[PDB]
């Protein structure tokens, strides 16, 4: 049971849970990843975004296109090139509600652990990913 | 810090470590995932294999093609269609040495935790992925 296999199994339980939590907001999981990462790291390559959402860059460009058409992401051409993609007010509010449902989805998956185990598990994750 | 982000960070530390451990054996990480999964679950869709190696199905078909050309995977046409892909003796021996270097790579990543924390962490992973 390589570590990476154990990690993959956890992601395989998490992802459909997160997707279903996000559905009533009209968002796919890739769209959520784009919103969240762009909210924290404005000006991010769609390659990086795609590696984080584990989708091809072409799929991410399609995500970007949909989020821009929706008024949640913009790239206003600088009257000074074009500005790196950032969230609008709309996108920030979207992002916030989506982060709330994703947090609840996470807690639902983490309920398989006791409260102390959840804290230790998140610490261990932080250490391993540092 | 959504759980999935913490998981992604851990995979982002693990993957280059595993890739470098596998390089002297002449294997990419996708090739390793194909070998290992085919060793345990003969007859597996290249879609499933690709989702586990987080590469596109086309990339996986290329992996399959290389592992077949190498004498590690076969698909002997049944004298009885074509048989589902399985490992040859060569592929099994390859798989075994590769599993050994991947295990050592894993332990190197897990050394950031004490021995008891590593045991508890693997238990927690098993529970969350069950
Ligand atoms: N980094 C990774 C990803 C997946 C696996 C896997 O065996 O499924 C791995 O051994 C390492
Ligand atoms: N299943 C996943 C994968 C990635 C993320 C992420 O925010 O990076 C997530 O929130 C859930």
Residue numbers in the entry:
A (entry chain A), B (entry chain A): 7 to 86, 89 to 138
Quoted from the paper:
Rv2887 binds both SA and PAS in the same cavity surrounded by helices α1, α2, α3, and α5 from one protomer and helix α1 from the other protomer. Residue Arg42 of Rv2887 forms two hydrogen bonds with the carboxylic acid groups of SA and PAS, and residue Asp114 interacts with their hydroxyl groups via a water molecule bridge. Specifically, binding of SA or PAS causes the DNA binding (wHTH) domain to rotate up towards the dimerization interface by 15~20°, and the N-terminal to rotate forward to the ligand binding pocket. Rotation of the wHTH domain of one monomer and the N-terminal region of the other Rv2887 monomer result in the formation of a buried binding pocket for ligands, over which the N-terminal residues form a ‘lid’. The distances between the Gln64 Cα and Gln64′ Cα atoms are 13.6 Å, 14.6 Å and 15.4 Å in the apo, SA-bound and PAS-bound forms, respectively.
MarR family proteins are transcriptional factors which regulate the expression of genes involved in a wide variety of cellular processes, including stress responses, virulence, metabolic pathways and antibiotic resistance, mainly via ligand-mediated attenuation of DNA binding. Rv2887 functions as a transcriptional repressor; binding of effector molecule SA, or its structural analogue PAS, to the binding pocket of Rv2887 induces conformational change in its DNA binding domain, shrinking the distance between the α4 helices and preventing binding of Rv2887 to the promoter region of Rv0560c, triggering the expression of this SAM-dependent methyltransferase. Each subunit is composed of two functional domains: helices α1, α5, and α6 form the dimerization domain, and helices α3 and α4 form a helix-turn-helix (HTH) DNA-binding domain.
